[PDB]
Design a protein around this ligand. Structure first.
Ligand SMILES: [C][C]N([C][C])C1=[C][C]=C(C2=N[N]C(=O)[C][C]2[C])[C]=C1N([O])=O
Ligand SMILES: [C][C]N([C][C])C1=[C][C]=C(C2=N[N]C(=O)[C][C]2[C])[C]=C1N([O])=O
Ligand SMILES: [Mg+2]
Ligand SMILES: [Mg+2]
Ligand SMILES: [Mn+2]
Ligand SMILES: [Mn+2]
Lengths: 371, 10, 371, 10
């Protein structure tokens, strides 16, 4: 039973909203409402738009039919859980596209692929698409589309503690990420109709698969500090980032996908609050399952005593904060020149959200102390 | 952030 | 359909040959002939003898019935392939027991478990059993019993190149070792009758599982040089090996299981030749499968043009040689004082086998040059 | 030992 894509591959009614694909605060939920929750074609349409903008369809002679069929199957694979659904995959794909394509102040540029929304005439800006080969960029985009495939709505710790079959299968080593990559590649290789990489040679296909698997496995938060330390050590080196080195480019792609996977706190207030609501709903479901199983309820997963503000503040200060700081210090953070200083929307939004959470925590503590 | 690391597994 | 062990748990007819379990050149094939190839109870009987010698049955209150049932199921799991069969598992278990228990000259000793064949009165010798806790030793023995479980007779490279389902499942990352560990633990957790660790608490069971998985995954030869480099760096440090550190003990156990997995060249001439014949038969079967599939025949796997001597010489000089040298330099190699110098049977056997292979290679080259 | 490393995968 092959899950073939709907006959209209391109939806014209979305052509307006896709025009806002060039801004960081993309109204993705409005796109979900426009497309419809039943069909769930958001990821396929967004991926098609991004591939057209890059031109990877003509660069690699990618067949449209196979690409659309496989991405529709990938959309079907995502479960209807509050956070790790196809909406999150679309958001991560849009974020990696934004990070790779949008101008970066002071980034020197060296086949290669450039977005149609980038101005090559200007010499004061650069983009990661001008330093990363097209094959690696396509691998990064595909991995971002595959980063959380078939997510069960549970964390790695819950699966390990409960001795879930997935945990036993992968020997309690990056259970979620390994499962996502394995399921995505099994789906890709299961049907001939999903093979949109038929025009790649044997060596290129192997390299693409390796890059996609590495990028997917980089999304694990258990190894987050390892990646952060490695990236900081590479950047602080006098040599710096070498774009002619395969390992450095792989590390840069892994950092980009890691930053895009937790980009929620770095958005505007409305998107950040909606993503926080989704993730805390998923946490509450996991905590209810833990209570049913008799295990002690994990922190922040108790619906009776929510700690949403504390969770968000800790996540921003410990996970998102250092990662964004390292990415900006490396010089890969998109921004604009102000007249010379650099203005970044992502960093400003992260600071504003962190201040909001600190204010909420202080207000809650004051209210508790009064009572 | 003991609780956050416990959730993550670090 | 639980695979329950035969009603007689202990075989008396073997009690004589088990007396030779205290020597490195254990006639394992004679034991296979005595027991019988149909029943395949060699691994269970050898494991029972070793556990009785250590006393882990009384130390951890291990039930005999569950232990025997699970080890018989483990024996059944091993396939009848020329090399990676239950005979290899028994050999590796005997080798890890020999390395951990037999006296080591100059090794200082610090619950703990000592073998019944060790003289504690003498102060000039030590054993790894006196510095490694009983739980870690049991984990090492179980991992050695599980190191190559359900081996398909093919290398990691063959599985990756042919896009085997096991390779896709584990994302081309230690496919064989991950499969072995996952299958062994799934078999252990599948039936209540195989749970011989019921007397361990929750934390101890988790630590035991972690140690077993780490030891099993250490057996991969793709990461052999990584482990060798890490061990050399730890040993060359002025601090040296710290037996009070969990990480150092885990590394020592991993090195022991790695050395025991390739102990074949370190044995006497007859055992080494038999193991070489088995491994080259497995290589020839793999090469025949590669030729059938149309892939180019891998080196040393061409039955038409054998290179057995070259393969053995390369394996000894590149894999077994440096590993044995590092293990001996660390000071963990068993031996005896000669009157003060240290005599090691393992190193002498390895040198003799390497010289034999060099002589064979020189003779073959001379014969080829004459023609 | 190019052939040995190719077999191992290094
Ligand atoms: C599954 C990963 N993870 C649970 C451990 C997680 C997912 C999403 C968010 C999250 N929190 N806030 C948001 O704004 C949306 C996303 C980024 C946080 C976590 N986390 O580590 O606790
Ligand atoms: C499967 C591991 N491996 C194949 C790559 C392998 C197994 C066994 C032996 C082997 N060779 N000689 C012997 O004496 C018996 C064993 C140790 C060698 C290899 N190898 O790396 O080529
Ligand atoms: Mg994830
Ligand atoms: Mg093995
Ligand atoms: Mn994710
Ligand atoms: Mn082995």
């Amino acid at each position: 039973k092959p899950i073939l894509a709907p006959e209209p591959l391109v939806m014209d009614n979305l052509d307006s909203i896709m025009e806002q694909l060039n801004t960081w605060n993309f109204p993705i939920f409005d796109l979900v409402e426009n497309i419809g929750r039943k069909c769930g074609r958001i990821l396929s349409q967004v991926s098609y738009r991004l591939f057209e903008d890059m031109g990877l369809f003509e660069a690699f002679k990618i067949p449209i039919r196979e690409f659309m069929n496989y991405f529709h199957a990938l959309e079907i694979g995502y479960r209807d859980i509050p956070y790790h659904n196809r909406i999150h995959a679309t958001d991560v794909l849009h974020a990696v596209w934004y990070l790779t394509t949008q101008p970066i102040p002071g980034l020197s540029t060296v086949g290669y692929v450039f977005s149609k929304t980038y101005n090559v005439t200007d010499d004061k800006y650069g983009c990661l698409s001008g330093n990363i080969p097209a094959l690696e960029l396509m691998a990064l985009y595909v991995a971002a589309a595959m980063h959380d495939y078939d997510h069960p709505g549970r964390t790695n710790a819950f699966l390990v503690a409960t001795s879930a079959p997935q945990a036993v299968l992968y020997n309690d080593r990056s259970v979620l990420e390994n499962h996502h990559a394995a399921a995505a590649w099994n789906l890709f290789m299961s049907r001939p109709e999903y093979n949109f990489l038929i025009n790649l040679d044997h060596v290129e296909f192997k390299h693409f698969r390796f890059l996609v698997i590495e990028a997917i496995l980089a999304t694990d938060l258990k190894k987050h500090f390892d990646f952060v330390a490695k990236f900081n050590g590479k950047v602080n080196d006098d040599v710096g980032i070498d774009w002619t080195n395969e390992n450095d480019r792989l590390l840069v792609c892994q950092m980009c996908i890691k930053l895009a996977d937790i980009n929620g706190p770095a958005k505007c207030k409305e998107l950040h609050l909606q993503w926080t609501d989704g993730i805390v709903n998923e946490f509450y479901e996991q905590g209810d399952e833990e209570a049913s199983l008799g295990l002690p309820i994990s922190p922040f997963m108790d619906r009776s005593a929510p700690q949403l503000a504390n969770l968000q503040e800790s996540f921003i200060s410990h996970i998102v904060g250092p990662l964004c700081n390292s990415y900006d210090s490396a010089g890969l953070m998109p921004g604009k020149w102000v007249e010379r200083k650099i203005y970044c929307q992502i960093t400003q939004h992260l600071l504003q959200n962190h201040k909001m959470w600190k204010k909420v925590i202080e207000e809650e503590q004051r209210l508790a102390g009064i009572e | 952030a003991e609780n956050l690391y416990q959730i993550i597994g670090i």
